[PDB]
Design a protein around this ligand. Structure first.
Ligand SMILES: CCCCCCCCCCCCCCCCCC(=O)OC[C@H](COP(=O)([O-])OCC(O)COP(=O)([O-])OC[C@@H](COC(=O)CCCCCCCCCCCCCCCCC)OC(=O)CCCCCCCCCCCCCCCCC)OC(=O)CCCCCCCCCCCCCCCCC
Ligand SMILES: CCCCCCCCCCCCCCCCCC(=O)OC[C@H](COP(=O)([O-])OCC[N+](C)(C)C)OC(=O)CCCCCCCCCCCCCCCCC
Ligand SMILES: CCCCCCCCCCCCCCCCCC(=O)OC[C@H](COP(=O)([O-])OCC[N+](C)(C)C)OC(=O)CCCCCCCCCCCCCCCCC
Ligand SMILES: CCCCCCCCCCCCCCCCCCCC(=O)O[C@H](COC(=O)CCCCCCCCCCCCCC)COP(=O)(O)OCCN
Ligand SMILES: CCCCCCCCCCCCCCCCCCCC(=O)O[C@H](COC(=O)CCCCCCCCCCCCCC)COP(=O)(O)OCCN
Ligand code: HEC
Ligand code: HEM
Ligand code: HEM
Ligand SMILES: CCCCCCCCCCCCO[C@@H]1O[C@H](CO)[C@@H](O[C@H]2O[C@H](CO)[C@@H](O)[C@H](O)[C@H]2O)[C@H](O)[C@H]1O
Ligand SMILES: CCCCCCCCCCCCO[C@@H]1O[C@H](CO)[C@@H](O[C@H]2O[C@H](CO)[C@@H](O)[C@H](O)[C@H]2O)[C@H](O)[C@H]1O
Ligand code: FES
Lengths: 61, 54, 55, 71, 244, 383, 124, 85
């Protein structure tokens, strides 16, 4: 309301175990999973898509 | 958790290596899993299921 | 109507009969009976000679 | 024999009876009208396509799944 | 437009391939090929299908080679430049019944029977339209319909008068797998076969779609977590204002 | 100084995708811009790939598309991706334009990005129209015929211009080959104009849903909007997947699987769905030239929104009457779309005319009046 | 439209007894449904400011009014991004919805419009 | 009308203290269930009329038009069709 040294209430959001390795590791697991599926999705996409340039079925026949 | 963080996550080089190796595993295992599941839900319908008659 | 080729000399107005939906064209090739909306289109043609036309 | 024949007959006599009767009555009217002379020189010649469509649409609704179950 | 001008809309039949996860029934595809070959192929071509296309779908390599080898195809000219024929190979396309459109129309009272390779995609209704059309010739046209000569009444066909007569009757085909060849059964099999001919990637496409759906859904869920994680300092921001 | 700021090339990228200061309160409707960029990238990738397998000659075109479907590895996917992404491109562009109209993005100081945007929209229409012809099925040919014949309405020279466009006396091989070359080109022109409208925007920055300045409270484009864009990218890719893999032909016309036949006329010749509203507007005017003018005016009239909006406030978030009018305008635009594909029959003929009057009266009468009255209500109502 | 226009037309209405009797109640409901008060804005915070005239009027605001406007805009932006509404004292009460900016913009526009007129004077 | 970081073009700011906490210190899905139910209900309720009124009006117009068109092209609608054309 007036004093700027009285931090507003963040208790509804604060985690108690915020400084722990487990805490960070969980968020990096989510980031990592997302990076993993993006890598696997990119690989699948690139491989299937670029295969159009390999000899078509009529040519292989 | 400290150990896991320190080995696989702390260095980005290691984090990216772990992500890429995981993607390789995922890709191979997911392929096999879907192939089997697809064959079960479409059982007796596919060429592989009737091929033996011919 | 839709774009079949009428069988000539047949019809009911003895010109052309489209067998597809049964539209009858005349000796002028005018539509008389059937689904067809218009008379058989005339191309742009001229008699260069009296013995040859160009279309 | 064709399973459809039985299924179609059953559906016409049963769930689609109102439409069956409409089609029947239409046919009766049109045939009688064709019988009368100077029909060829009439302005409007009635058909029964509409009634037929209503009946067939109904039979198909009551039969489609049953028929494919026995093929 | 009148309903007759549109044609009656076909029922939705429960095809084996209806269903996000469902393939064609390949036994039905094989039976449908036999209906094509013994009935439809008299008037209709299937020009976009090669003998190799049947292999591992409906037939083995050997069966399809045998079908190809029974036919003669135009070879390259001989050494004097005279025409020659050769036996068919797997690479050859299934040959049509007529040499040209003019011959096709002459044999069908002016009508040209369409090529059937894309017919399931080229008509509203797809398999349902093919099945409805083949099985939907009434014994008698509805009272008052005047058919043009050489036209047959079929309510599914727009306008009602089709130049193709009914062709499927109980037992025109003897299936090699012992299935009773009723009108309905043959129409179902050939409609399935034609659907496959229009879209032969169907089975693979739907399986790849399942993989894509799973991966993309997971990525969507994770992207929500990551967005919320990154945005939380902005969403949680608080202010104290002391007017200067 | 950081390299991303010091190096002139890196700094240009930096200014647009990384340090770019954004309002902190953009909602999900600000995500259509990046979806449109994604559609453009997919169309370039799939389109260039199709060009490696497609033959533009009229004797081979339709069959080259069948060869892509049947023989080219993953050809079916590349073709369906290209055809469906054309529809998604229009869904995203209508959403992006609807966002712009609702939130007042056309108002000063953003008149220039909006005006270049209107041209982007015209280029997208032309690009999509020419691409559809390339299949050379029945709808391809008859759609090309009907749409290209609208040029015959140009007085004095119209017929000459049509024959010049076709390269002959009807739609045929010369037309198809030139449409292929221009269809390949137009997406590059479109990318340049898309870049131009962003550079124009960069002077004011993005507007925001409240319509006020964001100079007081800015957020870096990255990481905040990068990660927020990923959500809609994955939502888009889910919709893409459902069409491309499970229903690849839902948005198409079956007649385009019949090869072009100049003799047989299809039952109904309609444009692709995204052009249908402009087709309904054209039908509404009985005169040929009148109808063409009205149809072009329906797009060019977007250029006058900066003038006819008389509001002292940017955007509709706080304007109840404007929000009602906008809702009716949007639904009317959808009804015009539907009327574009009905048969020319009663009572749709008159309904099409009424909806066309409503469409134009939004710009010319209603928006100027409503925005004037709301100005007065804000002033009196807050006294 | 110019603020001058809006203010003059409003004054014509407020003069006419009949007109005010029918317009003032409508304007008050409009403002209630508009809902800008529920984000803690005053009406004048919504006026488009990216114009020379408005930039000049804002520069002429007294420092305190200017600091308070900055806070209302920041606070409203935070409600907008959070999808929340103001509660309690953050809601603008009708008595707090003062036209703090209108006199400044009316003076800026008065000069701008007089300059335009005088640029077109004809010695008689 | 926009500058860049350090000279964005804000009027001078004074007297506002801003506070926030780290993404690692916060629960990103705090209060999600309340938001998903109550917040979405409030936001949707307040905008419902602006969607319902135009959608329902234009759907009604369409429904009437399509039903009339269908009826005009039946046998029963022959006479009314003849007048309409
Ligand atoms: C195509 C490719 C696929 C990609 C998807 C992109 C679409 C995302 C998007 O822009 O819309 C999401 C979008 C959510 O965006 P948001 O950032 O939460 O809020 C934007 C508005 O301020 C939200 O306005 P609001 O805060 O006033 O809340 C209104 C909204 C509720 O908003 C939601 O949160 C949902 O509810 C409705 O308006 C529903 C209409 C009532 C019918 C009964 O949902 C809507 O706003 C839908 C309402 C549109 C009418
Ligand atoms: C499209 C292809 C996607 C390829 C991504 C594959 C692996 C990269 C990845 O996940 O990035 C995580 C990494 C790291 O994400 P980070 O930046 O959150 O992690 C840094 C902090 N440590 C190292 C302690 C975890 O991001 C990058 O290196 C950027 C490359 C992304 C593209
Ligand atoms: C269909 C009719 C749509 C009318 C929308 C009316 C407003 C509404 O309720 O929307 C919710 C929201 C309301 O959001 P808002 O930003 O006005 O308010 C947020 C909440 N308050 C007021 C508390 C700050 O509107 C949007 O998000 C509108 C974007 C419009 C996109 C239109 C796409 C149509 C394409 C056709 C192109 C031509
Ligand atoms: C261009 C069009 C973009 C849209 C892509 C959506 C799916 C297309 C992928 C092709 C496909 O069918 O892949 C499936 C998996 O999908 C997936 O898992 C792919 C979904 C991933 C979405 C996008 C992620 C990144 C893609 C774009 C990056 C491209 C360049 C970056 C290097 C299954 O195919 P399969 O698993 O049998 O494949 C062989 C490897 N086992
Ligand atoms: C499509 C596939 C998704 C993108 C794959 C990127 C990898 C995802 C995980 C990597 C990751 O989170 O690390 C960040 C990389 O993100 C980035 O650097 C990129 C963030 C998101 C990229 C998407 C941008 C907008 C997408 C919309 C498309 C645009 C239209 C054009 C087609 C680092 O970044 P950090 O700052 O969080 O690091 C925090 C500390 N190092
Ligand atoms: C001896 C002639 C003949 C036989 C046998 C024949 N058809 Fe046809 N078919 C035609 C003719 C002629 C048409 C063109 C009819 C028309 O357009 O009026 C046609 C048209 C079709 C159409 C398209 C109708 C449309 O919507 O344009 C399909 C589908 C069709 N046939 C499938 C089959 C199938 C499946 C079989 C047999 C299993 C079959 N046909 C057997 C002569 C035949
Ligand atoms: C804004 C970008 C683009 C849009 C909106 C677009 C739209 C279209 C459309 C609607 C079609 C018809 C698709 C069908 O039904 O089969 C098509 C076909 C085609 N487009 Fe594009 N296109 C774009 C970019 C490109 C580019 C950059 C190329 C590069 C050559 C290209 C090459 C093709 C080819 C070869 C075809 C014909 C083969 C086919 O039909 O799939 N397109 N395009
Ligand atoms: C290829 C087509 C287009 C692309 C890729 C594109 C991309 C973008 C992007 C990335 C932005 C900034 C982010 C956003 O607000 O969404 C944007 C803003 C804008 N675009 Fe587009 N755009 C395209 C077409 C159009 C069209 C057709 C118009 C107008 C008719 C338009 C008008 C605008 C306007 C006015 C803005 C500023 C909106 C604001 O932030 O307030 N754009 N566009
Ligand atoms: C910088 C990137 C590096 C180079 C990129 C590589 C380009 C092309 C390499 C692989 C493309 C062909 O590689 C091949 O891909 C197809 C899928 O696409 C796979 O094929 C597999 O799936 C397809 C459909 O998904 C089935 O029809 C097939 O029966 C099955 O074996 C092959 O198992 C693989 O051998
Ligand atoms: C969108 C894809 C990413 C590629 C970038 C798009 C290419 C367009 C860039 C060329 C247009 C020139 O772009 C122009 O660049 C300069 C610096 O780069 C920007 O300048 C801005 O940033 C720099 C520092 O980041 C400051 O010195 C300057 O005060 C500020 O205005 C302009 O605001 C922008 O309009
Ligand atoms: S096609 Fe000639 S009568 Fe219909």
């Amino acid at each position: 309301g007036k004093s700027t040294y009285k931090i507003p209430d963040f208790t509804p959001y604060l985690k108690k175990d915020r400084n722990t390795d487990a805490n960070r590791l969980f968020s990096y697991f989510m980031i990592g999973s997302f990076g993993m599926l993006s890598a696997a999705g990119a690989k699948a996409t690139v491989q299937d898509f670029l295969s159009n340039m390999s000899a078509s079925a009529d040519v292989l026949a | 958790a400290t150990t896991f963080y320190n080995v696989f996550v702390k260095r980005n080089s290691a984090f990216v290596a772990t992500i890429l190796a995981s993607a390789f595993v995922f890709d191979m295992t997911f392929e096999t899993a879907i192939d089997n599941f697809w064959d079960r839900i479409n059982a007796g319908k596919q060429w592989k299921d009737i091929r033996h008659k011919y | 109507h839709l774009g079949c080729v009428p069988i000539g000399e047949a019809g009911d107005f003895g010109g052309w009969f489209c067998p597809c939906h049964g539209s009858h064209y005349d000796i002028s090739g005018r539509i008389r009976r059937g689904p067809a909306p218009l008379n058989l289109e005339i191309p742009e043609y001229d008699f260069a000679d009296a013995e040859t036309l160009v279309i | 024999p064709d399973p459809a024949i039985a299924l179609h007959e059953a559906a016409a006599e049963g769930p689609c009876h109102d439409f069956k009767h409409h089609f029947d009555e239409c046919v009766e009217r049109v045939t009688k009208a064709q019988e009368a002379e100077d029909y060829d020189h009439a302005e409007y010649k009635e058909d029964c396509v509409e009634e037929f469509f209503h009946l067939q649409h109904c039979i198909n609704d009551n039969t489609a799944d049953k028929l494919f179950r026995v093929l | 437009m009148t309903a007759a001008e549109h044609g009656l809309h076909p029922a939705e039949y429960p095809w084996p391939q209806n269903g996000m996860l469902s393939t064609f029934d390949h036994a039905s595809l094989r039976r449908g090929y036999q209906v094509y070959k013994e009935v439809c192929a008299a008037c209709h071509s299937l020009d976009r299908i090669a003998w190799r296309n049947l292999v591992g779908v409906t037939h083995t390599t050997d069966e399809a080679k045998a079908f190809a080898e029974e036919l003669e195809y135009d070879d390259e000219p001989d050494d004097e430049g005279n025409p020659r024929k050769r036996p068919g190979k797997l690479a050859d396309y299934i040959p049509g019944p007529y040499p040209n459109e003019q011959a096709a129309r002459a044999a069908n009272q002016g009508a040209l029977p369409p090529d059937l390779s894309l017919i399931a995609k080229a008509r509203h209704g797809g398999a349902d339209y093919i099945f409805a059309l083949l099985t939907g010739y009434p014994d008698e046209p509805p009272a008052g319909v005047v058919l043009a000569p050489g036209m047959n009444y079929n309510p599914y066909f727009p306008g009602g008068g089709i130049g193709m007569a009914r062709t499927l009757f109980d037992g025109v085909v003897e299936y090699e797998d012992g299935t009773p060849a009723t009108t309905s059964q043959m129409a179902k099999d050939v409609a399935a076969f034609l659907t496959w001919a229009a879209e032969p990637e169907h089975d693979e496409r739907k399986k790849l779609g399942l993989k894509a759906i799973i991966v993309i859904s997971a990525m969507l869920g994770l992207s929500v977590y990551i967005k919320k994680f990154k945005w939380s300092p902005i969403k949680n921001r608080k202010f104290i204002y002391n007017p200067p | 100084m950081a390299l991303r700021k010091k190096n002139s090339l890196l700094n240009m990228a930096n200014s647009y995708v990384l340090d770019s200061p954004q309002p902190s309160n953009l909602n999900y409707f600000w995500n259509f811009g990046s979806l449109l960029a994604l559609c453009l990238v997919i169309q370039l990738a799939t389109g260039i790939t199709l060009a490696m397998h497609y033959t533009s000659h009229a004797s081979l075109a339709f069959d080259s598309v069948e060869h892509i479907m049947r023989d080219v590895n993953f050809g079916w996917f590349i073709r369906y991706a290209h055809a469906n992404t054309a529809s998604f491109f229009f869904i995203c562009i209508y959403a992006h334009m609807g966002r712009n109209i609702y939130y007042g993005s056309y108002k000063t100081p953003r008149v220039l990005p909006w005006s270049i945007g209107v041209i982007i929209f015209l280029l997208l229409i032309i690009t999509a129209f020419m691409g559809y012809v390339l299949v050379f099925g029945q709808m391809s040919l008859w759609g090309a015929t009907v749409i290209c014949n609208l040029v015959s309405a140009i007085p004095w020279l119209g017929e000459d211009i049509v024959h010049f466009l076709w390269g002959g006396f009807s739609v045929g091989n010369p037309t198809l080959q030139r449409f292929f070359a221009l269809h390949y080109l137009m997406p590059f022109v479109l990318a340049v104009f898309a870049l131009l409208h962003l550079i124009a925007l960069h002077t004011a920055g993005s507007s925001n849903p409240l319509g006020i300045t964001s100079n007081v409270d800015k957020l870096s484009m990255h990481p905040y909007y990068s990660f927020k864009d990923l959500i809609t990218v994955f939502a888009f890719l889910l919709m893409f997947t459902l069409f491309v893999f499970f229903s690849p032909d839902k948005l198409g016309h079956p007649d385009n699987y019949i090869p072009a036949n100049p003799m047989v006329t299809p039952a109904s010749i309609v444009p692709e769905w995204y052009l249908l509203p402009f087709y309904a507007i054209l039908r509404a005017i009985p005169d040929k030239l009148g109808g063409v003018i009205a149809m072009v005016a329906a797009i060019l009239i977007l250029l006058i929104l900066p003038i006819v909006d008389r509001s002292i406030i940017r955007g509709n978030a706080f304007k109840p009457i404007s929000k009602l009018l906008f809702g009716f305008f949007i639904c009317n635009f959808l009804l015009l779309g539907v009327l574009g594909q009905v048969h020319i029959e009663p009572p749709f003929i008159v309904l099409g005319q009424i909806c066309t009057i409503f469409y134009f009266s939004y710009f010319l009468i209603l928006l100027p009046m409503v925005s004037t009255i709301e100005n007065i209500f804000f002033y009196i109502g807050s006294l | 439209a110019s603020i001058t226009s809006v203010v003059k037309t409003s004054e014509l209405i407020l003069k006419s007894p009949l007109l005010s009797k029918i317009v003032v109640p409508l304007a008050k409901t409009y403002v209630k449904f508009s809902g800008y008060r529920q984000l803690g804005f005053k009406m004048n915070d919504l006026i488009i400011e990216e114009t020379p005239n408005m930039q000049l009027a804002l520069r002429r605001l007294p420092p305190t009014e200017s600091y308070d406007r900055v806070y209302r805009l920041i606070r409203a932006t935070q409600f907008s991004l959070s999808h929340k509404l103001a509660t309690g004292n953050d809601i603008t009460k009708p008595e707090e919805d003062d036209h703090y900016l209108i006199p400044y913009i009316l003076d800026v526009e008065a000069e701008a419009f007089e300059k335009d007129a005088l640029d077109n004077l004809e010695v008689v | 009308y926009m500058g860049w970081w350090g000279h964005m073009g804000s009027p001078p700011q004074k007297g506002i203290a801003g506070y926030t906490i780290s993404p690692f210190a916060a629960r990103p899905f705090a209060g999600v269930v309340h938001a998903a139910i109550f917040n979405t209900f409030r936001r949707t309720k307040n905008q419902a009329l602006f969607v319902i009124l135009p959608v329902s009006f234009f759907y009604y117009v369409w429904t009437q038009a399509s039903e009339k068109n269908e009826w005009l092209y039946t046998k029963a609608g022959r006479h009314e069709l003849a007048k309409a054309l």
